[PDB]
Each structure stands twice: as structure tokens, then as C-alpha cells.
Design a protein around this ligand. Structure first.
Ligand SMILES: C[C@@H]1CC[C@@]2(OC1)O[C@H]1C[C@H]3[C@@H]4CC=C5C[C@@H](OCCC(CO[C@@H]6O[C@H](CO)[C@@H](O[C@H]7O[C@H](CO)[C@@H](O)[C@H](O)[C@H]7O)[C@H](O)[C@H]6O)CO[C@@H]6O[C@H](CO)[C@@H](O[C@H]7O[C@H](CO)[C@@H](O)[C@H](O)[C@H]7O)[C@H](O)[C@H]6O)CC[C@]5(C)[C@H]4CC[C@]3(C)[C@H]1[C@@H]2C
Ligand SMILES: C[C@@H]1CC[C@@]2(OC1)O[C@H]1C[C@H]3[C@@H]4CC=C5C[C@@H](OCCC(CO[C@@H]6O[C@H](CO)[C@@H](O[C@H]7O[C@H](CO)[C@@H](O)[C@H](O)[C@H]7O)[C@H](O)[C@H]6O)CO[C@@H]6O[C@H](CO)[C@@H](O[C@H]7O[C@H](CO)[C@@H](O)[C@H](O)[C@H]7O)[C@H](O)[C@H]6O)CC[C@]5(C)[C@H]4CC[C@]3(C)[C@H]1[C@@H]2C
Ligand SMILES: *[C@@H]1O[C@H](CO)[C@@H](O[C@@H]2O[C@H](CO)[C@@H](O)[C@H](O)[C@H]2NC(C)=O)[C@H](O)[C@H]1NC(C)=O
Ligand SMILES: *[C@@H]1O[C@H](CO)[C@@H](O[C@@H]2O[C@H](CO)[C@@H](O)[C@H](O)[C@H]2NC(C)=O)[C@H](O)[C@H]1NC(C)=O
Ligand SMILES: *[C@@H]1O[C@H](CO)[C@@H](O[C@@H]2O[C@H](CO)[C@@H](O)[C@H](O)[C@H]2NC(C)=O)[C@H](O)[C@H]1NC(C)=O
Ligand SMILES: *[C@@H]1O[C@H](CO)[C@@H](O[C@@H]2O[C@H](CO)[C@@H](O)[C@H](O)[C@H]2NC(C)=O)[C@H](O)[C@H]1NC(C)=O
Ligand SMILES: [Cl-]
Ligand SMILES: [Cl-]
Ligand SMILES: [Cl-]
Ligand SMILES: [Cl-]
Ligand SMILES: [K+]
Ligand SMILES: [K+]
Lengths: 537, 537
């Protein structure tokens, strides 16, 4: 066995922690919560995983570290009762992470790469959401049935091209920082058209002006016709908000400055149906017609602190996939505690610096545009990139398509290993495999469980379920590291310097509080199920 | 043993089938779906239960009919594998039916009896729903903790006053029919104020007129001030829909006629946010301000056929609670098949005649008012009653409060009987009881599971879950009546004239199709769970 700390523990952790939400939902989170509460979300979500890594270091520095996987380490160091729960919650987390990584790639393909490749269209006037959901479901079934046949046939080709999907992530992050440094000197040009406080969708109309001049004559623009329903300049059929207020362009990226970071510093939560608005603009109060409501950037979902925590939390998960090479290492009780902790530190520094960067460079109206309606249907992340916005689009699409394949290769192996362990004979038929050892019936069950997450068809609806499963897994790891100390069991003597039972209790309580924060209802259901299984045994 | 067919089988079935949805969601269903599709919903939902009663008659006409409950009949006539599934699905159905019956009584109390007894108020302008949900949850916890202490202390007093809650239902139905016959000759006076096609909420403004006369002077009314935001008659700040259109009262109950039944005959489905509108009125097309949108009757939820089936279906359930007295009967193989089938026939005739009655008497704009906003916050059912609308309000409130108590007494006995059977030792601690035999730990588990249904806080959100559990129970009964015939098992010779295996197959397929109709997602999850338990055994 010869695998270092770098290519054995650190690089798979750093490949599994970075993902879809850094490129799709982090600018929206900064713009919705403010820089201060966004740093609070990043700090709270990166203390569950740091204390969980301190507990996994106490797992790794005990005994012999049996070869293969993180399931076998926990199962041989903590008994079959805790290990089965950890393995089952981590299997369910990986199978729904595959669904979230597929839905991210479909969102990138349908809203940024190929917009006219849409089957279902928003008929009528309103409900542009049901066509979006039915459009996500069809491409979800197609990409899931393709990427399960790829895993069924081409495991060696997925394992051979596993570092290319990490190179894509690193290039598409260095482009963000290279453009964010350029914006100090030479910011790019993305004009945002507004009307009073309200920002409007630039994709529909042509020119951001109330009147224009053609043939030495003042003619009402296309923007006049959407609000007043006549090409005549002296009608009284206009809404009184459009009449009293003036139409103004602003720079969507004003560059890195202190006055920009000062305005993006506080929370601006909106309910579903509200319009994204500035604060430092004059606006005359007047009622507005209901028929001009599609001519604005509108909050898609209702937001709060507890909504944003549950959407952010699957950015930080990925500790447990740095112990999968625990048989190939030279010194497995040295490479795992150093590697997982340094990977969590570097990824959390990237998240803090990116929160401060997006808060100081991009203006909060562009930040609060989920799907980028204020700027010509572009990525808000992509507008800040240095060479072109297409770098982040292509790199994020290939990174999500790679992270879905790696989850669809990682979860059937885990169900294979749990079934072959005879720990629950109810799953005995899922230990059947090929002559290679590759699973056959576990891959089908992962494709069926990840289909139930695709049929939810939203990134923001699937992500709290992922938070709910990974927080249960990380809670059982901290339970199993505190109980074995407090019960004074034999064969539990961790040789790790920075381990103490109070840190595992603190991690258990923190990953229990985040369970109530992300979604209180299903946490209250899982608490009943867990309190019932305890009354059994 | 001496119990007849009438007081032993027929009256408990007829007490358990009638309930909350006949008085709260049936007029809304008629107005939303039309008379033809409402009769289709009633006909489809009353063929799952009729074929399920034909299968329960084949259960009852086999063997000895062991004493006590419907669980023991199925468990001794079909084996412990089918019987455990039937008993567990029927237990979960009864524990969520208690939650639906509590939420119905809270809806009646907060919207019709005591409106100012509300803790949470709709602050701001919009979101009158979140205050409503948080207002349902608090009174749900209060009424659940009261009606579990009543069941823990006063079982004999709940059993002594069980016929009073049936007398309330029968009086409050005979009042509906007595007023619906009066409306042929002398219809009551409930004026509905409208403005073009759109109907408005009468509870806010005073007089249904655009201008009025005080002191020999024409003065703008209170209804003018809500739409134009000025008491001056010559302003141009009005919305152009209010200016071009005229304000008109109609009779909310025009009486039983053929021209009224002809207009309520077709479907009018609305999406969330649409305004309830007539069809036979002139209306000038004009845009409308967003700030006048609370001055209208608005569809609360989006409706379709599959939404209304899942809300109607728990009106028909209640077959299985006519075999609870199977030890007290004289001829249990005669009283059960006659009693359950005659009770299903009489309740289904009441539903068909009530659909035709509400379609022919009440106008469809009043029918499509869920919560009765068009007529002064009254029950749409209650406006048709003969003596007063308070009869239906008080009778429906006491009937839902009684049907919640009877579910909270029926489900702990079932969990008691399943736990004492040693069929699943995982539930062994729930067979502990008092010295009387009354359960202690099963009553707590019913209070905890019915709390998870109360915290959903909607009648229309809890009702498809009830449909999902009762359709699984009725599917397992038809499976277990077709498999024992087709496998040619011994000790299965039903002596019922009208039984055949094709009727049980037809009932199984119909109660499987309704499972996909009511909610396709959770049916698709339950199909995976059932197909996995089959791959185990
Ligand atoms: C050990 C062995 C391994 C395999 C196995 O066990 C044995 O493992 C277990 C694990 C099981 C799974 C455990 C958990 C599960 C999650 C569960 O979802 C619960 C709720 C969510 C799903 O929502 C549903 O989504 C469907 C599809 O949309 C809806 O159906 C609708 O579909 C159509 C639309 O066209 C229409 O008819 C209706 O809309 C409806 O029928 C369901 O209704 C819906 O419940 C998460 O959804 C939640 O939805 C909320 C919306 O109200 C949302 O709130 C917010 O919504 C928006 C944000 O988008 C905002 O406006 C507001 O902020 C909020 O309103 C919530 O965010 C969101 O959480 C499904 C089952 C599943 C997967 C288990 C399956 C079995 C399992 C794998 C077993 C196996 C056997
Ligand atoms: C044998 C032994 C006995 C005991 C035991 O096992 C062992 O038995 C089992 C049985 C288990 C139970 C099985 C089933 C269960 C149902 C499951 O619910 C699934 C979905 C529904 C719940 O929705 C959730 O409701 C909560 C509360 O609202 C939401 O949380 C929200 O709360 C706040 C609000 O302030 C806010 O933060 C967010 O809103 C959110 O956090 C959840 O998000 C939500 O998922 C049904 O809800 C569905 O919601 C849809 C809305 O999107 C709705 O679609 C339609 O919505 C409206 C209609 O109102 C319309 O506009 C449209 O037409 C649609 O959008 C759907 O109609 C609706 O179906 C919960 C678990 C439970 C009870 C199991 C518990 C465990 C159990 C008892 C075991 C035990 C151990
Ligand atoms: C929108 O912008 C215009 C600028 O064109 C403001 O118009 C005022 O115009 C008069 C004469 O045209 C000037 O003397 C004033 O100085 C302008 N006011 C300013 C610059 O504040 C108009 O008031 C603006 N609308 C607003 C602020 O609601
Ligand atoms: C944007 O402008 C509006 C008025 O042009 C600001 O004023 C609010 O308007 C709403 C109407 O939707 C009222 O309910 C509020 O009471 C108004 N607030 C006041 C007068 O302080 C609105 O605040 C502005 N948006 C910002 C600053 O984010
Ligand atoms: C609303 O109702 C009024 C009735 O007061 C309609 O007014 C018209 O008024 C003129 C003179 O006042 C009459 O000669 C017409 O016969 C009326 N038209 C009718 C009765 O159709 C007014 O047109 C109505 N608004 C509509 C239908 O949009
Ligand atoms: C009620 O009146 C309106 C117009 O006063 C009718 O017309 C529809 O108006 C909507 C605007 O919300 C348009 O989108 C439709 O195209 C109009 N339909 C037409 C012109 O046929 C509306 O149909 C009426 N409602 C009814 C009859 O239920
Ligand atoms: Cl991610
Ligand atoms: Cl992980
Ligand atoms: Cl009912
Ligand atoms: Cl029933
Ligand atoms: K991740
Ligand atoms: K019922």
C-alpha cells in the first residue's frame, strides 16, 4: 500500500465537498441574508463538520483501521448497532445527493446553456413554475437512466476521469477570484434597468428608456407598450407607478469597494411574490396594475434564516468520502485526521472569502436575482469571471455531472458492503453482484430512490432532505464517540491529541440543533422514530 | 349475546361514515367540479367501499366469527400476514382521522362560532394563511391534549353519550333537506355583491352601491374608498375595472329551479389566486390594481379532479367500525353483511341527493366560496337550512368533536389488540394497560401520531393522507380475499351469495387506481416499500 495524505485523503475530500451550491445558490444566499448572516450560516455549518471530523479522527486513531471504506472502520470500532445506522443514513444521503446533483445540471442546461431545449412551456399568463417542474422531471428521468447505464457498463472510465472533474472545479473557482480582483480596477459592463425601487426583467424589452427617437421623432419604446398598452404618448391607461417614476440604468457590477460592501451588509428577506428592490433610490408611491407584474424580478420562494441554512448545508458534506481509500494508505491513522481536517479548513476558507467577495463586488439586486433575470439570463457567479461567463457555466455543468456519477458509484458499493455484512438480512438480496464484484441489485435500488428525489424537481426542495440525512449521520457518529467514552467500554482508546468527549457532545448538540433549523417537522418525525426504536431495545 | 342488525352493525356504520366533509367541503366540491363531475366523484368513491364491503361479507360468512373487533376476524380467517397489514393501516387511518376531525372543529370554531378568538393575526397586507396555520396549530394542541385526557379518564361517559352525536348529524341533515324543499316556494335572502364578473367580500364594506345619498347629497360610499382611495367623485386614481363596470346584487340562494341547476352543471376549476366569477354577466375588460386584490373572493388552493377525489374520499370510510361488536351480535354472519351494505347504500344515496340539492338550490358563486366570504362569513351549507344557520354550525361542531373522541377511543384499542397478539414483538410494550384493560401506552402513541397530523394544520392537506391509508387497508382486504380463492387454501369457504373472486379483483384494482389519483407521489413511494417487503419474504 502506497497512498500519501495528498492523493489519498485530501484530494477526494476536496473533490467531494465542492459542488453545485457554490455556483448556483451562494450569491443568492449572500444577497438574501446579507454578508453578516451569510458568514454566520457558513460558520455554523462548518462547525458540525469540523467536530464530526474530530470524532472521525478518534475513529481512525483507534486499533488497526480495517481495509476498505468508512463503513468498516465505524462497524469494527463501534459495534454493529451504531455502524448500521451510520451506514444507512450515509447511503440515503448519497442517493439523494445524486438527485440534487442531477437537478443542478438540468437547471444549468435549461436556464443557461440551451433555453429553447424545453418541452413544456408556461402557457397562459402565470404559472411559469409548473412547466418548470414538469420540464425538470423529464430530463431528470433521462439523465438518471443514462448515468445509471454508464455506471453499469463503464466503472473503469468513470474512475479514470475522476481528476478532470476536480480540475474543472478548481479552474472555475480561480476564474471567480481572477475576475473579482480585476473588478477593483476594470469592472465589466452589465447594465441593470430599474423603475423606481423596482428592478425589471431585461430579457423581454429592447432598450432601457421610456421614450426614444427614430426619424427625428420622439416615439414610445417597446418598454412603454408593456406598461401602457398603447404606442401613444398622451394616454391615461398607464399604471400610476410607471407615470410618476423614472427609468434608470445602474452598473450591475460596480466593482470591489467599501460603499458596495456596506450596502450588501444587512438582511433583505422577501416573501413569495415580492419584487426585488434597492434602498438608496427615490421612488414615488403609487399603486401598480396586476397585469404588469410579469415585468419585474420576483422572489421565487419565501426566504428566512432557517430556509437558507437547509439549502447551504449540503455544500459542506463530504467528510466520509475521504476514508474510502483506508486500505490503500501507508499510515491510515495519520493521513485521515490530517487530510480531512485540512480539507474542511481549506473549503471553509474558500466559502468565507467567496461570501466577502460576492458581497463586496456584485450589487445586491443582481445577487437577489435567482436565475439572473435582471441581467439578460446570465449566472450572477458568471458575470464576475475573468475570461468569459461561459467558463463557470461549462465548468459547473461538468462538475455536477461528475459529482452525480461519483455518488451513483459510491452508494451501491455501500449498500453492497452493508448487505454482505449480514448485519440486516432483510437486505440480503442486495449483496448479489457481478463476477467483478460490482453490484447489480444495489444499483437499481439507488436508481429507484434517486428517482423519488428527482420527481420533487426543485433544488431548494431536495436540499433540506439531504441536510436531514447527513445531519442524522453526523449525529450518530458523535453519539457513538461519546457513549463509548462515557460507558468506559474496552477496545476504545483513541490516540488522537485533540480529542475530548466534550467536543463530541458539542458536535452532537450542534448537529441536533441544525436538524431542527433545517426542517423542524421531519426532524420531529425522525425523533419519534428514534425514540420508538429505543423503546424496542 | 343480543344485538340486532340495527343497533349492532347499521347504526355504528352510519355514525362513522357521516362526518366533517359533508358540512364543510361538499358545497365547495359541487361548485368547483360541477354537478356531473361531483356525481362522478361520489360514484367512484362509493364503489371502492361497496366492493370492500362485499369482501368483508366473505370474511364474515366464513367460520365462527371470533368475538371482538374486525382485526380478529381478518386475523383468524386470513392468517397473520394479511391481518397485521390490515390492522396497521386501519390504525394509522384512525389516528389521522382523529387529527382531521379536530382540525374541522377548529375551522368551525375560528371561522363561524367565535371569529375574535384568534391568537395570531394576518399582519401586513398579504399572507392571511400563515396566521391561519399558526392559529390552527395552537388550538390543535389544546384540543388534542384535552380529548386525550377525556379518553384517559372518562371512557364510560364517552360510550354513554355516543348516540347524541348521531342525533346531531341526523337533525343537521334533515334541516338541510327541510330548507332545500322550502327554497322551491320561499327562498331565503342572502344578497351577493358583485362588480362585473368578479364577486367581492361583503364583510369589509357596508353598502353594495357605488354612490349613495346622505343629507340630500350624493356621497361616495365606503365601497368607493376601497377602490379609488379618495372620497371625491371626480378623481382619476381609480382602477379602470371599477370605472367601466357597475355594481350589482344577486340572490345568493335563487331557490330550486331548472335554470339554476343548468348553470351549475359544468366544471369551473381555478388556480391559486384567481377570482370567483360568474358566466352570464356583462363585464368590460380592463386591468385592475394589485392593491384592490384583497377586495375579492379568491380561490384558496389550486383545484382539479385529482385534488377533489382525495378530499372527498374520507367521507365514505367507516365500513370496518361496524364489525367491532362482532361478539355481541346474535347472528354475526347475517347482521354484518346486511348492515354494512345497507349503511353504505343509505349514506351514498344521501351524498347523491345532496350533490343534486346543492347544485340546484345554491348559486355556484356562493358554492365556490370556501369559508363563505361572499355571504357575510356564513356556512354555504348553513344558508340553506330551515330554522336558522346556527343549527348546522352547532351540530357539525359537536359531531366533529364526537367523531374525534370516538377515533381516540377506537385506535388505542386496536393497537392494544395487535400488541397483545404477539404478532409483532416490536410493539410489545403497547400491550400494557390498566387493571380495567384500558390502554395506557397506546393512547400516548395515538396522541403523538395525531399530533403530527395536527401540525400540518389544513383540512385539505391532511385528507389525502387519510385517503392514502384507508385505500391501502381496503386494498389489502381485497388482496386477501382474492389470493385465498386463487390459491385454493383450506379453511376458506365463504357462504355469501353475492361473492365472487372477480369482484374482489375489481375492488383491488379500483382502490389501487384511487391511490394514484389521490396523490401519485406517496402512492409511488408506498409501492416501492411494498415491492421491497415482497422481495424480503
Ligand atoms: C434502509 C432501506 C433503504 C431504502 C429505504 O428504506 C429501506 O429507505 C427509506 C428512505 C425513504 C425516503 C425518506 C424520505 C422521503 C422524503 C419524502 O418527501 C417528504 C416531503 C418532500 C416531498 O414533497 C413532495 O413532493 C411531491 C412532488 O412534488 C409532491 O407531490 C406533488 O406533485 C404534483 C405536482 O405536479 C401535485 O399533484 C402536487 O404538488 C403534489 O401531488 C408532494 O405533495 C410533496 O409532499 C419535500 O417537499 C417539501 O414541499 C414543501 C412545499 O410545500 C416545501 O416547503 C417550501 O416550499 C417552497 C420551497 O420550494 C417555499 O415556497 C416555502 O419555503 C415552503 O412552502 C419543502 O421545502 C419541501 O421539504 C418522500 C419520500 C422519501 C423519498 C422516502 C421514500 C422511501 C425511502 C426511500 C425508504 C426506502 C424503502
Ligand atoms: C407501525 C408503527 C406505528 C407508528 C408508526 O410506525 C410504526 O407509523 C408510521 C406512519 C408514519 C407517518 C406516515 C406518513 C406521514 C405523512 C408525512 O407527511 C408527508 C407530506 C405532508 C406533510 O407536509 C409537511 O407539513 C409540514 C407542516 O406544514 C411542512 O413543514 C412546513 O412547516 C412550516 C410552516 O410554518 C415551514 O417551515 C415550511 O412550510 C415547512 O417547514 C412540511 O414541509 C410538509 O412537507 C402533506 O403535505 C403536503 O404539502 C403539499 C404542499 O406543498 C400539498 O400540496 C398542495 O398544497 C396546497 C393544498 O393545501 C395546494 O396549493 C396545492 O394543490 C398543492 O401544492 C399536499 O396536499 C400535502 O400532501 C409526515 C410524516 C408522517 C405523519 C409519518 C410519521 C411517522 C409515522 C407516524 C410512523 C410511526 C413511527
Ligand atoms: C426622474 O428623473 C428626472 C430627471 O430627468 C427628475 O426630473 C426633474 O426635472 C426637472 C425639470 O425637468 C429638474 O429641474 C429637476 O431637478 C429634476 N429632479 C431631480 C433631478 O431630482 C424627476 O424628478 C425624477 N423622478 C423622481 C425622482 O421621482
Ligand atoms: C421602494 O419604494 C416604495 C415606495 O415607492 C417604498 O415605500 C413603501 O411602499 C410600500 C408599498 O408597497 C408601503 O407598504 C410601505 O409602507 C412603504 N414604506 C415607507 C413609506 O417607508 C419602499 O420602502 C421602497 N423599498 C425599499 C426601500 O426597499
Ligand atoms: C351598468 O348598468 C348601467 C345601468 O344603470 C348601464 O347603463 C346604461 O345607461 C344608459 C343611460 O344611463 C341606458 O340608456 C342604457 O340602456 C344602459 N345600458 C344597459 C342597461 O345595458 C351600463 O351600461 C352597465 N355597464 C355595463 C353593462 O358594463
Ligand atoms: C369575466 O369578464 C372577463 C372580462 O371582463 C372575461 O374575459 C376574459 O378576461 C381575461 C382577463 O383576465 C382574458 O384573459 C380572457 O381572454 C377573457 N376572455 C374572453 C374575452 O373571452 C371573463 O371570461 C369573464 N369570466 C367568466 C365568463 O367566467
Ligand atoms: Cl454542493
Ligand atoms: Cl459526508
Ligand atoms: Cl367525513
Ligand atoms: Cl374504514
Ligand atoms: K458537497
Ligand atoms: K367518514
Amino acid at each position: 500500500p502506497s497512498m500519501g495524505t495528498l492523493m489519498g485523503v485530501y484530494l477526494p475530500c476536496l473533490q467531494n465537498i465542492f459542488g453545485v451550491i457554490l455556483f448556483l445558490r451562494l450569491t443568492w444566499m449572500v444577497g438574501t441574508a446579507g454578508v453578516l448572516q451569510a458568514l454566520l450560516i457558513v460558520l455554523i455549518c462548518c462547525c458540525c463538520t469540523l467536530l464530526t471530523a474530530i470524532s472521525m479522527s478518534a475513529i481512525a486513531t483507534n486499533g488497526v483501521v480495517p481495509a476498505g471504506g468508512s463503513y468498516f472502520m465505524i462497524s469494527r470500532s463501534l459495534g454493529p448497532e451504531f455502524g448500521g445506522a451510520v451506514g444507512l443514513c450515509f447511503y440515503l444521503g448519497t442517493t439523494f445527493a445524486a438527485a440534487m446533483y442531477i437537478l443542478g445540471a438540468i437547471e444549468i442546461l435549461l436556464t443557461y446553456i440551451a433555453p429553447p431545449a424545453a418541452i413544456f412551456y408556461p402557457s397562459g399568463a402565470h404559472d411559469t413554475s409548473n412547466a418548470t417542474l414538469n420540464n425538470m422531471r423529464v430530463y431528470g428521468t433521462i439523465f438518471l437512466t443514462f448515468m445509471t447505464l454508464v455506471v453499469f457498463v463503464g466503472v473503469k472510465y468513470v474512475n479514470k476521469f475522476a481528476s478532470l472533474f476536480l480540475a474543472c472545479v478548481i479552474i472555475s473557482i480561480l476564474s471567480i477570484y481572477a475576475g473579482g480582483i480585476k473588478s477593483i480596477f476594470d469592472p465589466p459592463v452589465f447594465p441593470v434597468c430599474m423603475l423606481g425601487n423596482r428592478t425589471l426583467s431585461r430579457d423581454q424589452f429592447d432598450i432601457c428608456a421610456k421614450t426614444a427617437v427614430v426619424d427625428n421623432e420622439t416615439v414610445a419604446t417597446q418598454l412603454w407598450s408593456f406598461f401602457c398598452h398603447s404606442p401613444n404618448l398622451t394616454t391615461d391607461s398607464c399604471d400610476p407607478y410607471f407615470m410618476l417614476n423614472n427609468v434608470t440604468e445602474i452598473p450591475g457590477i460596480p466593482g470591489a469597494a467599501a460603499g458596495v460592501l456596506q450596502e450588501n451588509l444587512w438582511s433583505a428577506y422577501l416573501e413569495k411574490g415580492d419584487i426585488v428592490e434597492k434602498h438608496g433610490l427615490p421612488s414615488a408611491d403609487a399603486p401598480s396594475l396586476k397585469e404588469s407584474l410579469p415585468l419585474y424580478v420576483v422572489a421565487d420562494i419565501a426566504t428566512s434564516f432557517t430556509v437558507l441554512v437547509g439549502i447551504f448545508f449540503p455544500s459542506v458534506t463530504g467528510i466520509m468520502a475521504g476514508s474510502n481509500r483506508s486500505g490503500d494508505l501507508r499510515d491510515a491513522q495519520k493521513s485521515i485526521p490530517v487530510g480531512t481536517i485540512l480539507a474542511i479548513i481549506t473549503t471553509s476558507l474558500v466559502y468565507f472569502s467567496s461570501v466577502v467577495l460576492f458581497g463586496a463586488c456584485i450589487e445586491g439586486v443582481v445577487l437577489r436575482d435567482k436565475y439572473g433575470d435582471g441581467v439578460s439570463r446570465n449566472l450572477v457567479v458568471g458575470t464576475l469571471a475573468w475570461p468569459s461567463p461561459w467558463v463557470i457555466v461549462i465548468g459547473s455543468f461538468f462538475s455536477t455531472c461528475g459529482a452525480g456519477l461519483q455518488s451513483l458509484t459510491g452508494a451501491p458499493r455501500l449498500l453492497q458492503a452493508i448487505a454482505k455484512d449480514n448485519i440486516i438480512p432483510f437486505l440480503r438480496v442486495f449483496g448479489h453482484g457481478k463476477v467483478n464484484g460490482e453490484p447489480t441489485w444495489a444499483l437499481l435500488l439507488t436508481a429507484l430512490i434517486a428517482e423519488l428525489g428527482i420527481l420533487i424537481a426543485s433544488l431548494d426542495m431536495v436540499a433540506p432532505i439531504l441536510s436531514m440525512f447527513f445531519l442524522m449521520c453526523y449525529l450518530f457518529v458523535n453519539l457513538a464517540c461519546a457513549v463509548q467514552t462515557l460507558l468506559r467500554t474496552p477496545n476504545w482508546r483513541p490516540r488522537f491529541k485533540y480529542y475530548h468527549w466534550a467536543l463530541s457532545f458539542l458536535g452532537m448538540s450542534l448537529c441536533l440543533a441544525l436538524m431542527f433549523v433545517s426542517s423542524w417537522y421531519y426532524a420531529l418525525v425522525a425523533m419519534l422514530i428514534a425514540g420508538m426504536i429505543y423503546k424496542y431495545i
